[PDB]
Design a protein around this ligand. Sequence first.
Ligand SMILES: [Hg+2]
Ligand SMILES: [Hg+2]
Lengths: 126, 112
Amino acid sequence: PLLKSAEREKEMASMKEEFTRLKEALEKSEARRKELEEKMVSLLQEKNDLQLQVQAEQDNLADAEERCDQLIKNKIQLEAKVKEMNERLEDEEEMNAELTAKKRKLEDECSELKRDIDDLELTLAK
Amino acid sequence: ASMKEEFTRLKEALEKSEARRKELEEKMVSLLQEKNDLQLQVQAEQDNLADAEERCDQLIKNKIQLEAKVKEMNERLEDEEEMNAELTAKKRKLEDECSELKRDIDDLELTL
Ligand SMILES: [Hg+2]
Ligand SMILES: [Hg+2]
């Protein structure tokens, strides 16, 4: 063009591209911002959902633990019963031994008595 | 407005946008720490629950072993209890034989 029409058209073409560039810089920034807005929303929901699993698992451990408690009180009563039964067995066995001894010594005496009765009948008879 | 105010509006919109983004980038760092920690915590707790459950099973097996041992002993005790009672009866019959025998010895000795 001629000097003046070229200079005028040049400034207009420059302002259009400068504008177009600012517009795109904004669009891009907005995109990054939007992607983050979405990520932050998703993470907060993820975090709060885990805070509930922690609670829930802690509760299951509480129920598991309480079950151990009952079992342990039960083991206590049972070990007490074993101790007690073993004591009685010893008493029984000991007594049994003692009775068997007395029954045998009585047996030796009936042997001897029947023998002495026979000796006196020998003395008497002849 | 004029072209200059339109550009000024755009620069400010960008500065604002970029600023909001810095807000998010910094707030996110701390947010991920929290999420990773809670994820590891749930794994830790699940491990505890498995170990707790395992202790339950050992106790249950032990409980069974004991109740059985108690039963076996109750029955064995009853046998001993009956065994001693039968002996006591025998011992007693013999004692009465001694009594009778000693009496017969007395009667024969009076004959002499
Ligand atoms: Hg348990
Ligand atoms: Hg006797």
